[PDB]
Amino acid sequence: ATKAEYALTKLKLSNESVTYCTAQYNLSSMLPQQLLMLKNQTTQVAEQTK
Amino acid sequence: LTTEQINMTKEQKEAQRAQTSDTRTDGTRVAGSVGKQKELYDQQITSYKR
């Protein structure tokens, strides 16, 4: 049982590694793109106000 | 597209202002289709009197 649990902990490193890469991709690509989306929406609100 | 609708709203306002008023928002006399239509009435009014 301890040996089986050791393998589970050892294999768990893969999920943590891909999670870090997934989070890194979101910060580098998704977040800046969403900022551009919000800016365009902000301008549209002013035009609708006009 | 919202910016383009600004001009259409202004122009449709002038069509509404053609009634109950002989001058546009800027103050110039209306001379378009409605202006020509009014002139026809003036000739017809004189024609009936004549």
Beta-sheet strand percentage of chain A?
Answer: under 5%
For the biggest sheet of chain A, the summary is: none
Number of distinct beta strands of chain A: 0
Shape, per Cα inertia axes of chain A: rod-shaped
Measured as a percent range, the helix fraction of chain A is over 70%
Order of helices and strands of chain A: H
Rg of chain A computed from alpha carbons, rounded to a whole number of angstroms = 21 Å
PDB class: viral protein
Keywords: dodecamer, bacteriophage portal, viral protein
Entry title: N4 Empty Particle C6 Tail
Chains A, B: Gp54
Write the layout of secondary structure elements.
This is part of a larger assembly, with 2 copies of chain A (50 residues).
Chain A: H1 2-49
